[PDB]
Amino acid sequence: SMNPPPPETSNPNKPKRQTNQLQYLLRVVLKTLWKHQFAWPFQQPVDAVKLNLPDYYKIIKTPMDMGTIKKRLENNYYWNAQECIQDFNTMFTNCYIYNKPGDDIVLMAEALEKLFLQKINELPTEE
């Protein structure tokens, strides 16, 4: 089977704004998680064809990855910071859903999620 179209990262019909939480999410949270040693499998959509994962898109109906989240931030696609947090949460739970406790990729995601949760606890108050 082919891969599905990647998640939308730009929509010309949506309104745009700048918020201090959205600015922090791109310039602090994502820039820290991206440089992490376990970030690389989450820096682009799951390429089920290249990775030979035929049942991936039969199980994962809501795919998400950091490449898409970053593109969404740079495009001002998110209005709220909650939408960006939901997407990171979707990325992690998708990994725990498809894979099993103890698999190497699940250990990688757990460590990335731990840094993410810590960086989100330091999120500034809305101005």
UniProtKB/Swiss-Prot annotation:
Positions of crosslink type Glycyl lysine isopeptide (Lys-Gly) (interchain with G-Cter in SUMO2): 58
PTM field: Phosphorylation by CK2 disrupt the intramolecular binding between the bromo domain 2 and the NPS region and promotes binding between the NPS and the BID regions, leading to activate the protein and promote binding to acetylated histones. In absence of phosphorylation, BRD4 does not localize to p53/TP53 target gene promoters, phosphorylation promoting recruitment to p53/TP53 target promoters.
Source species, domain of life: Eukaryota
Site feature (Acetylated histone binding) residues: 99
Impact upon substituting residue 99 to A: Abolishes binding to acetylated histones
Span of the signal peptide: none
Domain Bromo: 17-123
Recorded coiled-coil stretches: none
Tissue: Ubiquitously expressed.
Localization per Swiss-Prot or TrEMBL: Nucleus; Chromosome
Domain comment (free text): The NET domain mediates interaction with a number of chromatin proteins involved in transcription regulation (NSD3, JMJD6, CHD4, GLTSCR1 and ATAD5). The C-terminal (CTD) region mediates interaction and recruitment of CDK9 and CCNT1 subunits of the P-TEFb complex. It is also required for maintenance of higher-order chromatin structure.
Known role: Chromatin reader protein that recognizes and binds acetylated histones and plays a key role in transmission of epigenetic memory across cell divisions and transcription regulation. Remains associated with acetylated chromatin throughout the entire cell cycle and provides epigenetic memory for postmitotic G1 gene transcription by preserving acetylated chromatin status and maintaining high-order chromatin structure. During interphase, plays a key role in regulating the transcription of signal-inducible genes by associating with the P-TEFb complex and recruiting it to promoters.
Disease: Cornelia de Lange syndrome 6: A form of Cornelia de Lange syndrome, a clinically heterogeneous developmental disorder associated with malformations affecting multiple systems. It is characterized by facial dysmorphisms, abnormal hands and feet, growth delay, cognitive retardation, hirsutism, gastroesophageal dysfunction and cardiac, ophthalmologic and genitourinary anomalies. CDLS6 inheritance is autosomal dominant.
Subunit structure comment from the entry: Interacts with p53/TP53; the interaction is direct. Interacts (via CTD region) with CDK9 and CCNT1, acting as an associated component of P-TEFb complex. Interacts with RELA (when acetylated at 'Lys-310'). Interacts (via NET domain) with NSD3, CHD4, BICRA and ATAD5. The interaction with BICRA bridges BRD4 to the GBAF complex. Interacts (via NET domain) with JMJD6 (via JmjC and N-terminal domains); the interaction is stronger in presence of ssRNA and recruits JMJD6 on distal enhancers. Interacts with NSD3. Interacts with NIPBL.
Other remarks on this protein: JQ1, a thieno-triazolo-1,4-diazepine derivative, and I-BET, a benzodiazepine derivative, have been tested on tumors with success. Treatment with GSK1210151A (I-BET151, a I-BET derivative) has strong effets on mixed lineage leukemia and promotes myeloid differentiation and leukemia stem-cell depletion.
Family of the protein in this entry: Belongs to the BET family.
The protein's name: Bromodomain-containing protein 4
Originating species: Homo sapiens (Human)
Parent sequence residues shown: 44 to 168 of 1362
